[PDB]
């Protein structure tokens, strides 16, 4: 069903409208060029910016899902249609955790990494960093395990040492950290992205929860229970088998139409919480576009957002000529600094009461952009076509115009015509507004 070159295959008309719970699936030649290495061209840098894999629900919504699978065989008198299987069902997910699956996709992805990016990474050990959260490590430990894999298998390669994880940034509210928000105190207090995600729901959900209701007659739902319903889709099937082979009892209680109602929902609460409809959103990703600024132009970094002055100036936790770099993160985060990087800046503003679909928004969903599993890569070439570096960014697979520079057809700036593009970020963006 997963596979490391496509991603995640199986049922793809619901498995592909969970938004970020939805596993990773390859968007190569979608609303895109190919993502093949141009004719005459050499990767002469990649950052790789993954999420981590499928996980467990948070111990919060985990408490949340168990309390109404409860209370649900507690109070139905039946279990009629598609939703029988409710009257036995054993809720066993656990909290946080990667799932095997997860894992497993994890190790898909740095096996597709190195086979992507084979002439550079058989002599090159990438610098990795992730965030503090045991499933964020955890994706790492798996991408390097597959990373190796390959690289071990290839009798081309020269520079065998395994990659470690070099820093792990710890997730405080106290602590500025690249991979994750937390220390924008006015970002924090905000709740439009719930409001527009509750606002919504409150829209699709009345008609699903009268259909689940006359179902399951002697239990009451709320919108909200709807939507935890439609989550354990999901979640069971990311856990239920080790290679999410078996699609949940849970997918099919609800329709095709209420799958692509449900993916938007997802796709509004990342772009009203973390994108451009947020703000503060595209601000939380400023930190890490002025890391890969430093990155891709070999220089210091120049952040006063949420970097971490020591750790951006010791070449250990740092350094500036790694040709290869990966960093672990979390979908809201990813979000953001996709955002600031200008990478969405032909989506507008997100219809609250149409679905729209990823080819009306240029590409962004959730399930597009941050799946289970997430990763862009951005990387730098040098083309016989072209004297200065071109930059290229992918996402998932899709390749993703660059915005404020002269983009070619394949979708690339020049070097320093991409940074230059990238003014607001670099000077800090609305950062101030935080306090
Ligand atoms: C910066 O990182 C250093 C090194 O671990 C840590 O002592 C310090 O608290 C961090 N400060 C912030 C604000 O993140
Ligand atoms: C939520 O409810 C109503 C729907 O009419 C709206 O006027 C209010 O502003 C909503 N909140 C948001 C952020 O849309
Ligand atoms: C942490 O970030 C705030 C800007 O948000 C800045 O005032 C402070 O200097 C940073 N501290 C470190 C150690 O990077
Ligand atoms: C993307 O649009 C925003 C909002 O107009 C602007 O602040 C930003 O500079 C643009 N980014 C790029 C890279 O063109």
Request: net charge neutral; glycine share 8%; proline share 5%.
């Amino acid at each position: 069903c997963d596979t490391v070159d496509l991603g995640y295959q199986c049922s793809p008309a619901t498995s592909h409208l969970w938004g970020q719970y939805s596993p990773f699936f390859s968007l190569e030649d979608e609303l895109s060029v190919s993502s093949k290495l141009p004719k005459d061209c050499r990767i002469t840098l990649v950052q790789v910016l993954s999420r981590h894999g499928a996980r467990y629900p948070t111990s919060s919504k985990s408490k949340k899902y168990k309390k109404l699978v409860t209370a649900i065989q507690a109070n139905a008198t039946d279990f009629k249609g598609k939703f029988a299987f409710l009257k036995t069902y054993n809720y066993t997910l656990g909290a946080d955790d990667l799932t095997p699956f997860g894992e497993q996709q994890l190790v898909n992805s740095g096996i597709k990494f190195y086979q992507r990016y084979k002439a550079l990474a058989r002599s090159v050990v990438p610098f990795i960093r992730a965030s503090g959260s045991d499933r964020v490590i955890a994706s790492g430990e798996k991408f390097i395990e597959g990373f190796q894999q390959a690289k071990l298998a290839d009798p081309g390669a020269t520079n065998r040492a395994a990659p470690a994880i070099s820093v792990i940034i710890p997730e405080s509210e106290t602590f500025n950290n690249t991979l994750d928000h937390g220390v924008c105190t006015k970002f924090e207090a905000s709740q439009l992205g719930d409001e527009v995600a509750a606002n919504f729901t409150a829209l699709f959900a009345p008609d699903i929860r009268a259909r689940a209701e006359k179902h399951l007659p002697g239990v009451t739902l709320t919108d909200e229970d709807v939507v935890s319903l439609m989550d354990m889709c999901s979640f069971d099937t990311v856990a239920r088998t080790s290679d999410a082979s078996q699609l949940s009892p849970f997918c099919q209680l609800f329709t095709h139409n209420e799958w692509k109602k449900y993916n938007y929902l997802q796709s509004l609460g990342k772009y009203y919480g973390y994108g451009a409809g947020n703000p503060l959103g595209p601000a939380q990703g400023i930190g890490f576009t002025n890391e890969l600024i430093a990155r891709l132009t070999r220089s210091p970094v120049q952040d006063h957002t949420s970097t971490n002055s020591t750790l951006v100036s010791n070449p250990a936790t740092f350094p500036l000529n790694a040709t290869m770099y990966v960093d672990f993160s979390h979908d809201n985060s990813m979000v953001s600094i996709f955002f600031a990087l200008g990478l969405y800046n032909g989506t507008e503003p997100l219809s609250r009461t149409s679905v729209e679909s990823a080819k009306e928004l240029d590409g962004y969903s959730a399930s597009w952009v941050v799946p289970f599993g997430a990763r862009a890569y951005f990387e730098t070439m040098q083309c016989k076509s072209e004297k200065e570096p071109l930059v290229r960014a992918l996402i998932n697979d899709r390749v993703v115009p660059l915005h404020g520079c002269d983009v070619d057809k394949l979708g690339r700036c020049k070097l320093n015509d991409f940074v230059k593009g990238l003014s607001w970020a670099r000077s800090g963006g609305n950062w101030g507004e935080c306090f």
